[PDB]
Amino acid sequence: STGSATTTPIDSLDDAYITPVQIGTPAQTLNLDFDTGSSDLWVFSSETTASEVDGQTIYTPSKSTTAKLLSGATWSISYGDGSSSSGDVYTDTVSVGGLTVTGQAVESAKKVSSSFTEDSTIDGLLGLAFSTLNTVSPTQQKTFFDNAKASLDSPVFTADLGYHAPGTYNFGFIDTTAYTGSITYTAVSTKQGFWEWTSTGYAVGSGTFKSTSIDGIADTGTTLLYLPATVVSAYWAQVSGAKSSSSVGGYVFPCSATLPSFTFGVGSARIVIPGDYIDFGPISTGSSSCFGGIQSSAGIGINIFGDVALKAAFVVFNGATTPTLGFASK
């Protein structure tokens, strides 16, 4: 089997992407944030504290003839941005782009933190990291990909995120029309539960490529590119007037600037992030200070190849017995 679904930016900045997901019988369609950096499929629901729902579409398990309470199971997750959610668990039928999994754990939120409430466009998350990170207790649950894997034509999914435009998540096949050149594959460590890999270096603009190992995660659920402070300083040094602002929370730059590109290495191959992809617009409405899309990971503990990086590539998440990642230009 295969599946193919379009993923759409939630706003004009590509702050996140939502993909329609069918849950239950009859189908209830929710728009979920596909997140290769976490491993829980959780939704706003009829159980979510009413004051914490503000425009989201909710899953109502009592209206699904295939929903079943997973008795005793609870979940609770915290994300790197400080947001969180928790609740109980149902199993139900879940379909993405024509690919159906029966008995998928659907984690129903009883509580969500303010940032989830405040984003009316995201009805939940669909985790695509390794199932060892799944938070359901006392019986850990599998991701949608893990459940579907054996049925897929090939044990892969691909992320093809658009810049200021829709893109595609495919399951079970590699669309050879969706990328240019060849796909370069690179080794993955699953020891932390992430799609963790080592970039071979970087370049700023037309500058020379610096060969240096950068360990980090391919994370579709993180907006920006978070890299070591040395790398990030070298980037922003090429933008007149750019500075790190403690009050804003990162590098800002004059909105009048033209940003240089940023290249990262995948083996001997190179992925070029155009400068425009690094502009996240005014820090506040009407400001002439703009927020940068490349930020330091120094306070995180891990480097994160988020959407800014991944949207410059066609990315293969290869879930074979030894997982690997593939990157192609497009």
From Swiss-Prot:
Paired cysteines (S-S): 255-290
Domain of life assignment: Eukaryota
Active-site positions on this chain: 35, 199
Keywords assigned by UniProt, alphabetized: Aspartyl protease, Disulfide bond, Hydrolase, Protease, Signal, Zymogen
Group of enzyme by EC: hydrolase
EC number(s) given by UniProt: 3.4.23.22
Domain named Peptidase A1: residues: 17-328
UniProt GO molecular function: aspartic-type endopeptidase activity
Protein's GO biological process: proteolysis
Reactions the enzyme catalyzes: Hydrolysis of proteins with specificity similar to that of pepsin A, prefers hydrophobic residues at P1 and P1', but does not cleave 14-Ala-|-Leu-15 in the B chain of insulin or Z-Glu-Tyr. Clots milk
Protein family per UniProt: Belongs to the peptidase A1 family.
Protein name per UniProt: Endothiapepsin
Lineage of producing organism: Eukaryota, Fungi, Dikarya, Ascomycota, Pezizomycotina
